[PDB]
Structure formats: C-alpha cells, structure tokens
Design an enzyme around this catalytic site. Structure first.
Site, mmCIF file in Angstrom:
data_model
loop_
_atom_site.group_PDB
_atom_site.id
_atom_site.type_symbol
_atom_site.label_atom_id
_atom_site.label_comp_id
_atom_site.label_asym_id
_atom_site.label_seq_id
_atom_site.Cartn_x
_atom_site.Cartn_y
_atom_site.Cartn_z
ATOM 1 N N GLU A 11 -53.756 -12.007 -22.228
ATOM 2 C CA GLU A 11 -53.355 -11.010 -21.242
ATOM 3 C C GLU A 11 -53.936 -9.611 -21.415
ATOM 4 O O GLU A 11 -53.799 -8.767 -20.516
ATOM 5 C CB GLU A 11 -51.811 -10.819 -21.223
ATOM 6 C CG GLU A 11 -51.109 -12.074 -20.774
ATOM 7 C CD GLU A 11 -51.257 -12.496 -19.336
ATOM 8 O OE1 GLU A 11 -50.752 -13.499 -18.951
ATOM 9 O OE2 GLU A 11 -51.755 -11.632 -18.508
ATOM 10 N N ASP A 20 -53.271 -7.307 -11.331
ATOM 11 C CA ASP A 20 -53.663 -8.497 -12.056
ATOM 12 C C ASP A 20 -54.782 -9.284 -11.319
ATOM 13 O O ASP A 20 -55.328 -8.835 -10.326
ATOM 14 C CB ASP A 20 -52.479 -9.392 -12.443
ATOM 15 C CG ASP A 20 -51.803 -10.129 -11.274
ATOM 16 O OD1 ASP A 20 -50.878 -10.872 -11.422
ATOM 17 O OD2 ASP A 20 -52.373 -10.055 -10.115
ATOM 18 N N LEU A 32 -45.532 -8.753 -14.990
ATOM 19 C CA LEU A 32 -45.640 -8.538 -13.555
ATOM 20 C C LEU A 32 -44.555 -7.619 -13.027
ATOM 21 O O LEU A 32 -43.389 -7.780 -13.271
ATOM 22 C CB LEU A 32 -45.583 -9.855 -12.773
ATOM 23 C CG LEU A 32 -45.437 -9.492 -11.295
ATOM 24 C CD1 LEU A 32 -46.771 -9.373 -10.567
ATOM 25 C CD2 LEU A 32 -44.581 -10.481 -10.581
ATOM 26 N N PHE A 104 -45.492 -18.637 -18.879
ATOM 27 C CA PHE A 104 -45.549 -17.186 -18.821
ATOM 28 C C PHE A 104 -46.492 -16.754 -17.702
ATOM 29 O O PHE A 104 -46.224 -15.881 -16.908
ATOM 30 C CB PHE A 104 -46.151 -16.747 -20.171
ATOM 31 C CG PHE A 104 -46.228 -15.243 -20.306
ATOM 32 C CD1 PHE A 104 -47.307 -14.528 -19.789
ATOM 33 C CD2 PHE A 104 -45.230 -14.550 -21.007
ATOM 34 C CE1 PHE A 104 -47.350 -13.143 -20.005
ATOM 35 C CE2 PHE A 104 -45.300 -13.177 -21.258
ATOM 36 C CZ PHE A 104 -46.347 -12.444 -20.691
ATOM 37 N N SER A 117 -49.694 -34.187 -14.851
ATOM 38 C CA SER A 117 -50.171 -33.731 -16.144
ATOM 39 C C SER A 117 -49.020 -33.776 -17.109
ATOM 40 O O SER A 117 -49.184 -34.043 -18.281
ATOM 41 C CB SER A 117 -50.550 -32.261 -16.052
ATOM 42 O OG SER A 117 -51.718 -32.098 -15.285
ATOM 43 N N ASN A 132 -56.777 -34.155 -15.804
ATOM 44 C CA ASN A 132 -55.872 -33.844 -14.725
ATOM 45 C C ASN A 132 -55.585 -32.302 -14.597
ATOM 46 O O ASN A 132 -55.451 -31.728 -13.538
ATOM 47 C CB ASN A 132 -54.548 -34.635 -14.921
ATOM 48 C CG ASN A 132 -53.677 -34.595 -13.687
ATOM 49 O OD1 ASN A 132 -52.764 -33.753 -13.544
ATOM 50 N ND2 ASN A 132 -54.054 -35.348 -12.654
#
Ligand SMILES: [Cl-]
Ligand SMILES: [Cl-]
EC number: 3.2.1.17
Length: 162
Positions: A11, A20, A32, A104, A117, A132
């Site tokens: 990040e 972002d 966020l 996250f 998945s 996948n």
C-alpha cells in the site's frame, strides 16, 4: 515478514489525502476514506476518523493507528464471514496473510465472490487456484500486486515480497 509488513509494501505510506488506483480518496496505509468524489466529504470523514481537525494531513503515528484498526477489522471480518472463515481456518500462516491482504484490498464481500478460487484453495489445489484467481478484474487492474498474492498462495512462502 508478516501481514503488517506485507501490506505496508503493497500500500505504501502517505500522510496527505490521496487518490487510490480506483480514484478514491485515501490516506495513510491504504485507508479508504470515501468513495465520494468530494474532497470535503473526504476531509470530513478523515477528521471523524482521527478525532481532530486535520486539514487532510496526519502524522505517521495516526496513520499507523488507522492501519492497526484496519488489519484488525479485516481479520475479524474474515472470521465472521461464513464463506471466508472455513477457508482461512484451512490455511497455513503464510497463506492466511495473503487472504487477509486481499480482504483488506477489496472487502469481505469482494473476496467472498471468488467462490471457485476459494474452493480450490480450501482443497489445497495451489496451481489451479492461481490460474483461477488471475481470471479477474482484480488481476487485470492491479497485476503486479495480484501476481505477488498469487505467488504467495501458490507457494506458501514470502518469496514474492523479498
Ligand atoms: Cl475509521
Ligand atoms: Cl499493481
């Protein structure tokens, strides 16, 4: 390596409000603020989050404190999610951190959507799951980060992050 250091790598750290990869107002370590297009709205959410009149800038310490809260929330979010929990419980430590990272990034909901998945991971079919996962918008929009995660799920080691 651990979840904190891993996400800090994915990040970055910014002390002033920023946009972002999706164009949303964010601050700190991928925290966020809002999906709204308004900066005041963002500034507001920020002050509310920190507990002071920030004027869109925070300290490193405040950033870290949002980070800790966010990691904590993701974990707990996993544990409460009926699709997620069983997966997380089936995995080893390294792979658990990969799952947290994805939550996250995209929220519980987003992740709970990778039905197929998820199943493959729970089954421990590593390469299949890796194939996948890549068929997703997620991979096509943030390919390098996605490849890091995928390698991680595939191998069960931190090599992508060293
Ligand atoms: Cl918050
Ligand atoms: Cl990326």
């Amino acid at each position: 390596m651990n979840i904190f250091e891993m996400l800090r790598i994915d990040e970055g750290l910014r002390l002033k409000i920023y946009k972002d990869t999706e164009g949303y107002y964010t601050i700190g370590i991928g925290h966020l603020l809002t999906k709204s297009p308004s900066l005041n709205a963002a500034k507001s959410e920020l002050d509310k989050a920190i507990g002071r009149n920030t004027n869109g800038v925070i300290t490193k310490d405040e950033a870290e404190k949002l980070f800790n809260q966010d990691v904590d929330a993701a974990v707990r979010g996993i544990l409460r999610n009926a699709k997620l929990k069983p997966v997380y419980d089936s995995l080893d430590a390294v792979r658990r951190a990969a799952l947290i990272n994805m939550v996250f990034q995209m929220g519980e909901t987003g992740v709970a959507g990778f039905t197929n998945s998820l199943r493959m991971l729970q089954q421990k079919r590593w390469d299949e799951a890796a194939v996948n996962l890549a068929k997703s918008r997620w991979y096509n929009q943030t390919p390098n980060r996605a490849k890091r995660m995928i390698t991680t799920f595939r191998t069960g080691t931190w090599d992508a992050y060293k």
